[PDB]
Amino acid sequence: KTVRWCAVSEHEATKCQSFRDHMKSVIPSDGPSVACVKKASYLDCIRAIAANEADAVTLDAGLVYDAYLAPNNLKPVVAEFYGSKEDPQTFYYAVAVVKKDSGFQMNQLRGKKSCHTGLGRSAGWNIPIGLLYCDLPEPRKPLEKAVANFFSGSCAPCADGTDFPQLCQLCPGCGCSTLNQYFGYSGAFKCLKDGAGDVAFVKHSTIFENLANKADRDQYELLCLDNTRKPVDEYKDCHLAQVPSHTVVARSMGGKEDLIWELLNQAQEHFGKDKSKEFQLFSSPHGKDLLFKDSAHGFLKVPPRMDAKMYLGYEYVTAIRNLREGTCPEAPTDECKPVKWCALSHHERLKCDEWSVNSVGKIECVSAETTEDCIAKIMNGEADAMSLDGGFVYIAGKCGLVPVLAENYNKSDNCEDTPEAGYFAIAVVKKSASDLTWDNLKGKKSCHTAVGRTAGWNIPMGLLYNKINHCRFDEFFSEGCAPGSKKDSSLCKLCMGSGLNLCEPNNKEGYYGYTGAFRCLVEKGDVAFVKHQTVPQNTGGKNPDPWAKNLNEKDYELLCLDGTRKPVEEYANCHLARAPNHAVVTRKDKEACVHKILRQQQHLFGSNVTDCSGNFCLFRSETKDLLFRDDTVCLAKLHDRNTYEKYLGEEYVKAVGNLRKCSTSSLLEACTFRRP
Ligand SMILES: *[C@@H]1O[C@H](CO)[C@@H](O[C@@H]2O[C@H](CO)[C@@H](O)[C@H](O)[C@H]2NC(C)=O)[C@H](O)[C@H]1NC(C)=O
Ligand SMILES: [Mg+2]
């Protein structure tokens, strides 16, 4: 139970050894211990960790990436944080500050005038130039000269003035000290404030540190990667890169990550920010920033399904990858790159393969084990598009992806130009039970289409989470019928399935499905969770079955969240959530291409086509609902709804989130770690 920490200096090793001793005192024989391995450099520490001679070292984003690469393959496991638990600030943001209404975007920086914090600085140079690399003119080695030919004039502190003078044009001599008024963060910002430069590459924090009044900040904007702008307040939605300020790494396989976290968590409990004055984890007696930055206020456990690329973010890896590999294609700037679609089953891959050949190369295919792994592929560029249900549209939204096309299921003349927004989830009750409203629901008897289902379970129980705030969903209702629950649960007591079918989510349960839950309402329930048309189609002699011949709509009302009851036809105003259609999800920087390609694609192999055997067709599956749901007639454009929050109702998001507090998704907890 020992963590072998790696030092990169004699002073660091000394701090590690006193950390070992102090951890010795307070900790029982069982549990964390510290070993102090000492190597010559961060690179050497990485190669030692990979070679199982050390276990943990804490690194700057660049070395995080270095450690990620073959043959080391280390991963982030714990993260220093630089404020409070309520506002960690484990990351910072590299941004491009500009004058308000200066009239240009990220893809128009050529010819403009630049202000950098310093050459080799991450936010001031590495990140922006990395992203801009391919826009630099062809003799891209040496980099300083290509940057010089890119901008008309620059201040690039610490650059080689004598050889590349345009980089000192705004700060002649390129002083690498505060002597140069345009050096550093405050200097790169004053370079812009003084109108010397058109753009300043700095950190999110910098505008706030140099301008106290909101008034003056309001004449500054930020360049976003999508070639829009935003106010400086909104850097979390308009940054060049998000960068983890200081990250502990361990081996991927066999890394002891849990030991590292146990150890550091206890260490911060005993010797952290101020809670002891004998020894301070975040204070170097012999140097500065030994083992850990002295800014740090504490540690946070990194979610277990984070890999380096996911942690750093696609922008950052683009930046370093460009600056190290230095490979730009010659592909024509305007044309779209073939969209690689993500398959999660053997038959999904076979369908996508046929599609690819018939797409004459416009579509390609990428297999991945699971849905979440596919989403990961979209985020990090290994894949471009896939179709998701509501819940995964939400997880992908929290991961920065966007919906772009909705699967439309209702045939119509011009369905490409009208998305559908889905059916309505409702909570039905019988008028004969007058005192029932959304609030007293607790302790009453209930009927669900089936556990897992969207209208029968997810939306209702998600909205009710707030009236319970724990994950024992069978304790809200006295008794119920929720097919799929465990048989000895109270949510199985009212199910009427015979033999082995008693509580099984299948037709033989008979209180299963929309019809079945409504039957459970009329026969033995107080409330039943279904969609808007279930009552109209099981009443008035529309259902011939014995129980359902003579029931009439008037007898039932449906429960509204405001605490009032409403009639069935008024579902549009009385509903719990809007149960959404499947939607094609992609990364923002590919939204356009996807839009275009898919549309072309659904003209050919789309529902219009007969002789589906003589030619390929995109919405017919050999098995069931491969790639797209087989109901799809078209893919409808999501103008004005191209964000997970907009595409999914406010109510639906409330419900799915609340649920996800009980059913964790490792991907979702990673993504929320990077963006709360
Ligand atoms: C439902 O079916 C048709 C599409 O073929 C459309 O129904 C329309 O409903 C509105 C409101 O009741 C009427 O005013 C229109 O006259 C109907 N049109 C037709 C053709 O029936 C509607 O577009 C479809 N709904 C969805 C979501 O696609
Ligand atoms: Mg001591």
Q: Find tokens 């079955």 and name the residue.
A: 545
Determine the straight-line distance between the first and last CA of the chain, rounded to whole angstroms. 33
Token pair 């275009």 is found at: 596
Is the Cβ–Cβ distance between 378 and 585 less than 8 Å? yes
423 is in an annotated binding site: yes
* Burial class (CB within 10 angstroms; exposed 0-12, middle 13-18, buried 19+) of 385: buried
Single-letter code of the amino acid located at 145: K
User: What is the distance between the alpha carbons of residues 652 and 656, in angstroms, rounded to a whole number?
Assistant: 6
The C-alpha atoms of residue 148 and residue 132 are separated, in whole angstroms, by 13
Q: How many CB atoms lie within 10 A of CB 234?
A: 14
Q: Is 675 annotated as belonging to a binding site? A: no
d(CA 293, CA 291) in angstroms, rounded, equals 7
Question: What number of residues does the chain have?
Answer: 676
Q: Are 87 and 195 in contact (CB under 8 A)?
A: no
The CA 581 to ligand 1 mean position distance, Å, reads 17
Q: Any idea which residue has 């590459």 for tokens?
A: 201
Confirm or deny that 453 is annotated as ligand binding: yes
For residue 570, give every residue at least 6 positions away whose Cβ sits within 8 Å of its Cβ, in sequence order, or none.
none
Q: What are phi and psi of 217, to 5 degrees?
A: -60, -30
Cis peptide before 142 (omega within 30 of 0): yes
626 and 345 Cβ atoms separated by less than 8 Å: yes
Distances (CA, A) of 182 to 106, 114, 197: 22, 11, 10
Q: Which ligand is nearest the CA of 23, by number?
A: 2
Cα–Cα distance for residue pair 205/123, rounded to 1 Å: 12
Smallest CA separation from ligand 1 atom 17, residue = 412
Which residues have C-beta within 8 Å of that of residue 546, sequence separation ≥ 6? none
Domain with residue 541: its CATH number is 3.40.190.10
With a CB cutoff of 8 Å and minimum separation 6, the contacts of 172 are: 161
Question: Which atom in ligand 1 lies closest to the alpha carbon of residue 420?
Answer: 27
- Which residue's CA lies nearest to atom 20 of ligand 1? 412
Number of alpha carbons in the 13 Å side-chain half-sphere of residue 108: 12
526 burial (CB, 10 Å; 0-12 / 13-18 / 19+) is buried
Q: At what angle do helices 10-26 and 257-271 cross, to 10 degrees?
A: 80
* Beta-sheet strands, E only, within 350-475: 363-367, 385-388, 402-408, 425-430, 446-448
Atom number, ligand 1, closest to the C-alpha of residue 408: 28
CA 363/CA 341 separation, integer angstroms: 7
Where are the strands (E) in 510-607, listed by range?
527-531, 556-559, 565-566, 583-586
Cβ neighbours, 10 Å, residue 36: 19
**Nearest Cα to 396, choosing from 438, 342, 349?**
342
Q: Which has the closest alpha carbon to 109: 239, 234, 241, 224?
A: 224
DSSP character at residue 502:
T
Among the atoms of ligand 1, which is closest to the Cα of residue 409?
28
Q: What ligand is nearest to the CA atom of residue 418?
A: 1
Coil vs helix vs strand at 536: helix
Q: In the numeric block, which tokens belong to residue 51? A: 């070679």
Which runs of consecutive H residues, i.e. helices, occur in 567-633? 591-604
Please tell me what DSSP assigns to residue 580.
P
Here the tokens at position 275 are 């809670």
**Residue of 407, 408, 409, 412 to test ligand 1 pocket, by largest number of atoms within 8 Å of CB:** 412
Give the amino acid at 201: F
Distance 515 CA to ligand 1 centre (A): 24
CA distance 445 to 626: 38
The rounded distance, in Å, linking the Cα atoms of 390 and 627 is 15
* Cβ partners under 8 Å of residue 402, min gap 6: 585, 586, 587, 588, 591, 642, 643, 644
95: region left, alpha or beta (phi > 0 left; psi from -120 to 50 alpha): beta
CA distance 200 to 110: 14
Question: Considering only CA atoms, which residue is closest to atom 21 of ligand 1?
Answer: 412
**For tokens 């073959």, what's the residue?**
70
Any idea which ligand is nearest the CA of 278? 2
Helix H or strand E encompassing 244: strand 241-244
Classify each residue of 595-621 as buried b or exposed e, where b means 16 or more C-beta atoms within 10 Å of its C-beta: bebbeebbeebbbebeeeeeebbbbeb
Q: Which contiguous run of DSSP H or E holds residue 23? A: helix 10-26
CB atoms within 10 A of CB 410: 11
Mutate to test the pocket of ligand 1, among 407, 409, 410, 632 (most ligand atoms within 8 A of CB): 410
Q: Rg for the chain (alpha carbons), in Å?
A: 30
Atom 25 (ligand 1): residue with closest C-alpha? 410
Strands 229-231 and 2-7: unpaired
As a whole number of angstroms, the distance between CA 547 and CA 193 comes to: 77
DSSP sequence for 291-348: SS-TT--EEEEPPTT--HHHHH-HHHHHHHHHHHH-------SSSPPPEEEEE-SHHH
Which three-class secondary structure string do you get for 171-215? CCCCCCCCCCCCCHHHHHHHHHHCCCCCEEEEECCHHHHHCCCHH
Q: Where are the beta strands (DSSP E) in 471-526?
A: 480-481
Token pair of 308 as six digits: 């380096």
List helix spans (H) across 359-417: 371-379, 390-398
60 known member of a binding site = yes
Ligand 1 atom with minimal separation from the 421 CA: 27
Closest residue to atom 3 of ligand 1, CA basis: 412
Q: What span, in angstroms and rounded, lies between the C-alpha atoms of 234 and 230?
A: 6
Q: Work out the burial of residue 143: count CB atoms within 10 Å of its CB; fewer than 13 is exposed, 13-18 middle, 19 or more buried.
A: middle
* Structure tokens, 186: 């405050």
Atom of ligand 1 nearest to the CA of 415: 28
How many other CB atoms sit within 10 Å of the CB of residue 512? 30
Cα–Cα distance for residue pair 340/355, rounded to 1 Å? 11
Distance between CA atoms of 242 and 204, rounded to whole angstroms?
Answer: 10
- Strand-pair partners of 426: 530
Q: Which atom of ligand 1 is nearest to the CA of 410?
A: 28
Atom of ligand 1 nearest to the CA of 411: 5
Q: Write 511-515 long-range contacts (CB < 8 A, 24+).
A: 511/447, 511/481, 511/483, 512/449, 512/450, 512/483, 513/449, 513/450, 514/449, 514/455, 514/456, 515/543, 515/548
CA distance 493 to 451: 14
What residues does 300 pair with on adjacent strands?
Answer: 79
Sheet holding 385-388, edge to edge: 363-367, 339-343, 385-388, 583-586, 402-408, 634-637
d(CA 91, CA 675): 10
Of 300, 283, 294, the closest CA to residue 18 belongs to: 283
Residue 278 sits at the vertex; the CA angle it makes with 3 and 292, to the nearest 5 degrees, is: 45
Which structural domain range is residue 548 located in? 425-566
Secondary structure letter of residue 509 according to DSSP: G
Q: Is the peptide bond before 71 cis (omega within 30 degrees of 0)?
A: yes
List, comma-separated, the residues after which the chain is broken, a break being a C to N distance over 2.5 A; otherwise answer none: none
The amino acid present at 272, given as its one-letter code, is: G
DSSP label at residue 520: H
| Spatial contact of 463 and 561, defined as CB atoms under 8 Å apart | yes
Pairing of strands 247-251, 74-81: antiparallel
Residue 197 among known ligand-binding residues: no
Query: Which strands sit side by side in the sheet containing 247-251, from one edge to the other?
Result: 57-59, 247-251, 74-81, 298-301
**Which residue's CA is the nearest one to ligand 1's atom 28?**
410
Strand order of the β-sheet with 446-448 is 480-481, 446-448, 527-531, 425-430, 556-559, 565-566
The strand pairing partners of 81, in sequence order, are 298
3-class DSSP assignment, residue 403:
strand
Whether 259 and 32 have beta carbons less than 8 Å apart is answered as yes
Residue 182 known to bind ligand: no
Gap from CA of 22 to ligand 2 centroid (Å): 7
Judge contact between 337 and 596, C-beta under 8 A: no
Instruction: Tell whether the torsion through CA atoms of 62, 68, 72 and 78 is positive or negative.
Output: positive
* Ligand lying closest to the C-alpha of residue 277: 2
Compute the CA torsion angle 242, 247, 250, 252 (nearest 10 deg): -10
Determine the distance from the C-alpha atom of residue 418 to the mean position of all C-alpha atoms in its chain, rounded to a whole number.
Answer: 27
Q: Is the dihedral of CA 388, 394, 400, 406 positive or negative?
A: positive
Q: Hey, what are 339's tokens?
A: 């969209």
Q: Is 373 annotated as a binding-site member?
A: no
Q: Whose CA is nearest to atom 1 of ligand 1?
A: 410
Instruction: Report d(CA 549, CA 226) in Å as an integer.
Output: 58
Q: Which ligand is the nearest neighbour of the Cα of 421?
A: 1
Using CB distances shorter than 6 Å, the residues near ligand 1 are 410-412, 420
327's CB contacts (< 8 A; 6+ apart) are: none
Distance CA 543, CA 254 (A): 60
- Within 341-444, residue ranges assigned H as helices are 346-358, 371-379, 390-398
Q: What is the token pair recorded at 667?
A: 């991907």
Phi, psi of 634 (to 5 degrees): -160, 175
Give Cα separations from 262 to 57, 59, 300, 359, 672 (angstroms): 15, 19, 11, 52, 22
| CA of residue 75 to ligand 1 center, whole Å | 53
